[PDB]
Amino acid sequence: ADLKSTQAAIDQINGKLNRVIEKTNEKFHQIEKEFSEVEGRIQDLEKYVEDTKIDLWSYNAELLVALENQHTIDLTDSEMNKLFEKTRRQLRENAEEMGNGSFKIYHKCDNACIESIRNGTYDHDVYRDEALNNRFQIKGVELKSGYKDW
Amino acid sequence: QAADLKSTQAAIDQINGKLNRVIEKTNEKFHQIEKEFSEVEGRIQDLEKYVEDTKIDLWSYNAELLVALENQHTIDLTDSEMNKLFEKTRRQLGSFKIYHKCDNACIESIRNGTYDHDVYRDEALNNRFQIKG
Amino acid sequence: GQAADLKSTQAAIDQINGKLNRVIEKTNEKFHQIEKEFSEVEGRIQDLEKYVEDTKIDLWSYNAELLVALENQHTIDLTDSEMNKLFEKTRRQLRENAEEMGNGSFKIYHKCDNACIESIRNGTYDHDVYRDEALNNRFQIKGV
């Protein structure tokens, strides 16, 4: 094997290898970034769902109180107390009880979280396919020993 | 010294061969990953729409019960306490029917939708080629 | 001009093969890590969807119960057209999402068990960060 041609078929292969190395290093970091975004969106959405749930339950508690205050219902009646306890159990889960029973609500999904859920997008990289490497020849030279025909 | 051509060509060809299998398998895998990502992102977008529809319909119901009670003169939505409840519903919001952002297909997908989850076929390590010389 | 030295060539070839095999093993491994993370993300979205369904039916069940209490209390008459639409909206949900135990009685079954709930609040994804492979340097086969 000729040295010149041999180190050419070696530099060619190596250059192709180095492109594949550089591109995969790159693509993997993109893929990692995309995952963090998707995962971030899911955590934001989970927060939004919790916030949504708590506000609906807080509302249920507030309606029973408004109706009681105006004497339309009496929360001491058995069936009404049961509904009230249902709301308190769900609120106890969140909020607090600041003694006076009142439940102070705290959102977990801030305005950035809300915006991310509403209009956030994702960095979606598309890999630029790599061209396969052409087959090589490699030139060969004659050993100086033995008969060389005319 | 002096490496035999024939043999050296075989080593180079074994090497280039495996390399091309790697360029090919990774070329494809990355497009599969890109696809699975798009599906995952579509599922999240569809779930967000479902969450919104679920929330809005419950708030629509709250507004509707308030108006029904007022209508039969049980409550007055302008009274301070009642108006606070009424304002919460307005703030969150067919008279009390909001069209769904998550359609039948959207609902089908978030509940039963499957994924194009490609499992990579491990490429074997390339054996050492012993060049004759 | 000159012939390629055997020992140098074998060297240059093993050197390339060594780097390529590192790439093969590392991509093999990374792709499995990527697949595992996809499954986790997908499972989490599925668990969140289930938690939303449970949240939904519990709120609708509450709506239905208040209507019954108000009716029993005679605050509302379910015969009126508007009150009947409210009742239909709550019954509607129970019928689709709960088991009819007879005579308008329903048993609510949750799709998101403990763990599903923990997973949702717990978070955590096996997020692998690839260790960059170094470019391979030029090997000069004895000569030139």
From Swiss-Prot, chain C:
Glycans are attached at N122. Disulfide bonds join C112-C116. It comes from the Viruses. This is Hemagglutinin HA2 chain. The gene is HA. The chain holds residues 378 to 521 of 566 of the full protein.
